[PDB]
């Protein structure tokens, strides 16, 4: 492990210090359908004319990014994504920008969001949840070794590929930090107490988020929920967590250590780091090497009608992409 990560870091660093830029152009892609939306943009299924390959193109409105004060976060996102390389991280194939928008073209993951499947099915079995969780554990181990904090783990950001494996998407809040950081960001249900309490925090927030994810996958609902975020925040910092009767004792124990309000006791943040999670009883049947190599059989393989199929995604209202005649926010995104 240690040796693998060392070489991974060498590869990452070379790209981190000399990021790829302007590797394609809008006109090289055929826009097909919207697969998701956001505050400052959308993600569309596109077809690369020259290769016939399908990709997911994330379009960010520069003016909207600026209004929401997400310039640095957006620069972080592209700089980090173009530099990482892990089997469970979506690949950034191309990136460019025009007068109005920023574009990030990534590998298309046809199976749809875990969110969709989890909500439809209700809840995942422990072996099913364990399969996905293992992939997140390895991914965070990879990301953290690179001094990267992810900060946006949730079913909505995890896509299922053709082999039933996970693809982590959305690096909008990812940041390379060696010390502590203070930005209030993430999703209500997944925010660690440190974040809510406005104090400096670190990679430990990702491990708390993992606890929330595992709980939600196995229960079908998050450990902390309410109709308004403030009420959710009150539950998170309270230090109280109730588990469904069907949760195994091993799962409950893992979750109590993951959803630990006390940082000096939260799994993933102790002196043994990720090993305290990897070696936990709940993960006893998990072969970490096999997971990384994708040789473990997936509990669920999505249905497909062919290339470019979007049946595993919801329908979103389409909107024309207008590129202004004038350059917008050029200096703010010069390094993109």
């Amino acid at each position: 492990v240690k040796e693998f990560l060392a070489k991974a870091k060498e590869d990452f660093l070379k790209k981190w210090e000399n990021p790829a830029q302007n590797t394609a152009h809008l006109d090289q892609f055929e826009r097909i359908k919207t697969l998701g939306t956001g505050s400052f943009g959308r993600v569309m299924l596109v077809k690369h004319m020259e290769t016939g390959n399908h990709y997911a193109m994330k379009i960010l409105d520069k003016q909207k990014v600026v209004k929401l004060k997400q310039i640095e976060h957006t620069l972080n996102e592209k700089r980090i994504l173009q530099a990482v390389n892990f089997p469970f991280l979506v690949k950034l194939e191309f990136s460019f920008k025009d007068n109005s928008n920023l574009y990030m073209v990534m590998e298309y993951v046809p199976g749809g969001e875990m969110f969709s499947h989890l909500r439809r099915i209700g809840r995942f079995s422990e072996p099913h949840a364990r399969f996905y969780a293992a992939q997140i554990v390895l991914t965070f181990e990879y990301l953290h070794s690179l001094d990267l904090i992810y900060r946006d783990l949730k079913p909505e950001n995890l896509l299922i590929d053709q082999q039933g494996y996970i693809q982590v998407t959305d690096f909008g809040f990812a940041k390379r930090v060696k010390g502590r950081t203070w930005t209030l960001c993430g999703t209500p249900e997944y925010l660690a107490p440190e974040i809510i309490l406005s104090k400096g925090y670190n990679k430990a927030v990702d491990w708390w988020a993992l606890g929330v994810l595992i709980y939600e996958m196995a229960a079908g609902y998050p450990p902390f929920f309410a109709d308004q975020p403030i009420q959710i925040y009150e539950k998170i910092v309270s230090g109280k967590v109730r588990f469904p009767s069907h949760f195994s004792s091993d799962l409950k124990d893992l979750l109590r250590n993951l959803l630990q309000v006390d940082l000096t006791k939260r799994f993933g943040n102790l002196k043994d780091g990720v090993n305290d999670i990897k070696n936990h009883k709940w993960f006893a049947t998990t072969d970490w090497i096999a997971i990384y190599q994708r040789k473990v059989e997936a509990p669920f393989i999505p249905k497909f009608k062919g290339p470019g199929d979007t049946s595993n995604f919801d329908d979103y209202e389409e909107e024309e992409i207008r590129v202004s005649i004038n350059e917008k926010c050029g200096k703010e995104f010069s390094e993109f």
Binding site: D152, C185, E189, Y221, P222, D227
Partner: peptide, 20 residues
Amino acid sequence: TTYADFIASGRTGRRNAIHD
């Protein structure tokens, strides 16, 4: 049941991230 409470909540759809 907690499940019934969740399904009846306004937070079963896609959850937006919080900025600033």
